[PDB]
Write a protein that binds this ligand. Sequence first.
Ligand SMILES: CC(=O)N[C@@H]1[C@@H](O)[C@H](O[C@@H]2O[C@H](CO)[C@@H](O[C@@H]3O[C@H](CO)[C@@H](O)[C@H](O)[C@H]3NC(C)=O)[C@H](O)[C@H]2NC(C)=O)[C@@H](CO)O[C@H]1O
Length: 151
Amino acid sequence: GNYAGNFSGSSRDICLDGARLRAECRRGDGGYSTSVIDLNRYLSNDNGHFRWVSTATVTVQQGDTLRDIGRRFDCDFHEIARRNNIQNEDLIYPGQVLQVGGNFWDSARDVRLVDGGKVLEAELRYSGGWNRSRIYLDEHIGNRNGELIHC
Ligand SMILES: CC(=O)N[C@@H]1[C@@H](O)[C@H](O[C@@H]2O[C@H](CO)[C@@H](O[C@@H]3O[C@H](CO)[C@@H](O)[C@H](O)[C@H]3NC(C)=O)[C@H](O)[C@H]2NC(C)=O)[C@@H](CO)O[C@H]1O
């Protein structure tokens, strides 16, 4: 059951510039592109752990709670309230639009690449401390004719 991405096998000089991934990627025509993808768009900090959640919006329905929405979308409900400036996490409303996903960077430090560029490592804030977390970029990062892409 192969990873969907697999960028690393056709790239080199893989590096970071903030939350941005940069690589020299192999093209269809045999040449190279230098390409960048913002990992802050696709990676979230789920209370101390990298999670593949793309930046997005969800609309609250009758009967939803923040725990429910956090459950449904692999997000930490305390982050959803903080990110959406919800002072009372027990009070949300049908039709409320909430920003979810991405954003790992603003709760991360010691961000770096290990294992030849295949893995992203970082200390991620959780409620109570900092947790060293690692994620296989190849899971969802692909090279598409010289362009780093999410898939
Ligand atoms: C963090 C978390 O998820 N906590 C959960 C609580 O949210 C939840 O309490 C119930 O919350 C919902 C959602 O905010 C309440 O409904 C809102 O009520 C207002 C006022 O009546 C209404 O205007 C909104 O339309 C309505 N929102 C929605 C989305 O329908 C509801 O009244 C709360 N119910 C009670 C009994 O407190 C509790 C219970 O599910 O779980 C917590 O984990």
